[PDB]
Design an enzyme around this catalytic site. Sequence first.
Site, PDB file in Angstrom:
ATOM      1  N   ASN A  13       9.901   4.729   5.297  1.00  0.00           N
ATOM      2  CA  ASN A  13       9.909   5.566   4.101  1.00  0.00           C
ATOM      3  C   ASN A  13       8.499   6.113   3.908  1.00  0.00           C
ATOM      4  OD1 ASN A  13      10.034   6.758   1.582  1.00  0.00           O
ATOM      5  ND2 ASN A  13      11.291   5.131   0.682  1.00  0.00           N
ATOM      6  N   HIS A  73       1.007   0.141  -3.772  1.00  0.00           N
ATOM      7  CA  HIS A  73       2.372  -0.347  -3.636  1.00  0.00           C
ATOM      8  C   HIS A  73       2.465  -1.851  -3.924  1.00  0.00           C
ATOM      9  CE1 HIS A  73       3.511   3.350  -0.985  1.00  0.00           C
ATOM     10  NE2 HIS A  73       3.785   3.575  -2.252  1.00  0.00           N
ATOM     11  N   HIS A  86      -0.962   6.333   5.158  1.00  0.00           N
ATOM     12  CA  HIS A  86       0.225   5.712   4.584  1.00  0.00           C
ATOM     13  C   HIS A  86       0.364   6.043   3.101  1.00  0.00           C
ATOM     14  CE1 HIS A  86       3.029   2.476   3.500  1.00  0.00           C
ATOM     15  NE2 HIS A  86       2.188   2.248   2.509  1.00  0.00           N
ATOM     16  N   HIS A 134      -3.943  -0.538  -1.575  1.00  0.00           N
ATOM     17  CA  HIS A 134      -3.307   0.655  -2.164  1.00  0.00           C
ATOM     18  C   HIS A 134      -2.373   0.186  -3.272  1.00  0.00           C
ATOM     19  CE1 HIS A 134      -0.305  -0.039   1.037  1.00  0.00           C
ATOM     20  NE2 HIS A 134       0.546   0.619   0.278  1.00  0.00           N
ATOM     21  N   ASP A 167       3.505  -4.477  -2.322  1.00  0.00           N
ATOM     22  CA  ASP A 167       3.012  -5.476  -1.383  1.00  0.00           C
ATOM     23  C   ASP A 167       1.503  -5.641  -1.425  1.00  0.00           C
ATOM     24  OD1 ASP A 167       2.886  -2.883  -0.193  1.00  0.00           O
ATOM     25  OD2 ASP A 167       3.213  -3.659   1.815  1.00  0.00           O
TER      26      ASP A 167
HETATM   27  O1  LIG Z   1       4.628  -1.077   2.861  1.00  0.00           O
HETATM   28  B1  LIG Z   1       4.659  -0.416   1.525  1.00  0.00           B
HETATM   29  O2  LIG Z   1       3.286  -0.538   1.053  1.00  0.00           O
HETATM   30  O3  LIG Z   1       4.889   1.005   1.747  1.00  0.00           O
HETATM   31  C1  LIG Z   1       5.998   1.490   1.012  1.00  0.00           C
HETATM   32  C2  LIG Z   1       7.030   2.150   1.911  1.00  0.00           C
HETATM   33  N1  LIG Z   1       7.278   1.361   3.125  1.00  0.00           N
HETATM   34  S1  LIG Z   1       8.823   1.132   3.547  1.00  0.00           S
HETATM   35  O4  LIG Z   1       9.062   1.791   4.790  1.00  0.00           O
HETATM   36  O5  LIG Z   1       9.622   1.422   2.398  1.00  0.00           O
HETATM   37  N2  LIG Z   1       8.771  -0.445   3.878  1.00  0.00           N
HETATM   38  C3  LIG Z   1       8.610  -0.980   5.242  1.00  0.00           C
HETATM   39  C4  LIG Z   1       7.723  -2.171   5.009  1.00  0.00           C
HETATM   40  C5  LIG Z   1       8.175  -2.711   3.647  1.00  0.00           C
HETATM   41  C6  LIG Z   1       8.701  -1.515   2.859  1.00  0.00           C
HETATM   42  C7  LIG Z   1       6.521   0.303   0.249  1.00  0.00           C
HETATM   43  C8  LIG Z   1       7.618   0.287  -0.608  1.00  0.00           C
HETATM   44  C9  LIG Z   1       7.991  -0.902  -1.211  1.00  0.00           C
HETATM   45  C10 LIG Z   1       7.275  -2.062  -0.961  1.00  0.00           C
HETATM   46  C11 LIG Z   1       6.184  -2.039  -0.106  1.00  0.00           C
HETATM   47  C12 LIG Z   1       5.785  -0.849   0.515  1.00  0.00           C
HETATM   48 CL   LIG Z   2       5.268   0.560   5.546  1.00  0.00          CL
HETATM   49 NA    NA Z   3       4.471   3.400   6.396  1.00  0.00          NA
HETATM   50 ZN   LIG Z   4       2.530   1.107   0.848  1.00  0.00          ZN
HETATM   51 ZN   LIG Z   5       3.174  -2.223   3.238  1.00  0.00          ZN
END
Ligand SMILES: [O][B]1([O])O[C]([C][N]S(=O)(=O)N2[C][C][C][C]2)C2=[C][C]=[C][C]=C21
Ligand SMILES: [Cl-]
Ligand code: NA
Ligand SMILES: [Zn+2]
Ligand SMILES: [Zn+2]
Length: 231
Positions: free
Chosen positions: A179, A85, A148, A83, A87
Site C-alpha cells: 500500500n 504510521h 515510503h 515516520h 508501526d
Molecule cells: O509499514 B507502514 O509504516 O506503512 C504503511 C503501509 N504499509 S502496508 O503495505 O499497508 N503494510 C505492509 C507492512 C505492514 C503494513 C502502514 C499502514 C499500517 C500500519 C503500518 C504501516
Molecule cells: Cl510497508
Molecule cells: Na512501503
Molecule cells: Zn509507514
Molecule cells: Zn512499516
Amino acid sequence: EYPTVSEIPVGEVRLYQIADGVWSHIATQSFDGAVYPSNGLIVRDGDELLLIDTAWGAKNTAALLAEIEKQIGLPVTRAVSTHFHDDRVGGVDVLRAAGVATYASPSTRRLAEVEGNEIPTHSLEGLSSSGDAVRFGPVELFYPGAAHSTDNLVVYVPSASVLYGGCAIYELSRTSAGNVADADLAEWPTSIERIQQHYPEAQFVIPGHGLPGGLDLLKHTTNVVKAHTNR
Ligand SMILES: [O][B]1([O])O[C]([C][N]S(=O)(=O)N2[C][C][C][C]2)C2=[C][C]=[C][C]=C21
Ligand SMILES: [Cl-]
Ligand code: NA
Ligand SMILES: [Zn+2]
Ligand SMILES: [Zn+2]
Ligand SMILES: [Cl-]
Ligand SMILES: [Cl-]
Ligand SMILES: [Zn+2]
C-alpha cells in the site's frame, strides 16, 4: 538466527543483538488480514538506552519495555519515531507514561496529527530538507527525502556501521511494494541513492519489516519500488 514472523506471537517482542550496544526489536501485528513482522532499534546511550520506533501498538510496546528490562536492564530514556504510521508511533503513549521522552520531526508530528496517530512529545530540529543529518545521542538521524512517506527518517549507528532504514527499506523476501498511498514512489529511488551516497560504509542494513542484510537491501528496494511504479 534472526526471528521471523512465524516465530513471534502477536503481543510478544524479541530482541536481537546486532553489535556491542546495538539491538533490533521485533514484534508482529495483524493488518489487512495478514500477520507482519516489524523492526525497530535500541542503541546503548552510556548507561541509558535510545529507542528507535515503537513495537506497533500499545500492547506490543508495553511488551517491548518489559523485554528490554529483562534482557538489557538499562532504562529507555528517549525514543525517536521515524515516520507517522502506527508501526512507528503506535505505543508512544505507553512510552510517555513510562517516563520516556518521545521525539519525532515536526513533519512526523503534524502527519500523525492529521492521520489520528499518537504524537511524540518533542520536535527534532534540523531535519526539514533532503540530505539533512543531525546527531541524536549515539545515532545520526538522516532525512533522505520522500520515499515510503514524505517524513521518513533513517538512522545510522556510527559505532557499529548499522543503517536502520525503517520502512523506506524493504527486506529481500519482499518483492512487491504494498500500500503506497502515503508513499512518494517517484522520489523513492532518488532518496535511496541519497542514503547510498551518505552512508556507503554501512555493514548491516535493517529494514522496517523483516530480515536484516547488507547494502544490497537498498538496490533491492529500488528494484521493487520501480517495478510497482510500472504496474
Ligand atoms: O509499514 B507502514 O509504516 O506503512 C504503511 C503501509 N504499509 S502496508 O503495505 O499497508 N503494510 C505492509 C507492512 C505492514 C503494513 C502502514 C499502514 C499500517 C500500519 C503500518 C504501516
Ligand atoms: Cl510497508
Ligand atoms: Na512501503
Ligand atoms: Zn509507514
Ligand atoms: Zn512499516
Ligand atoms: Cl519528555
Ligand atoms: Cl525530556
Ligand atoms: Zn522531555
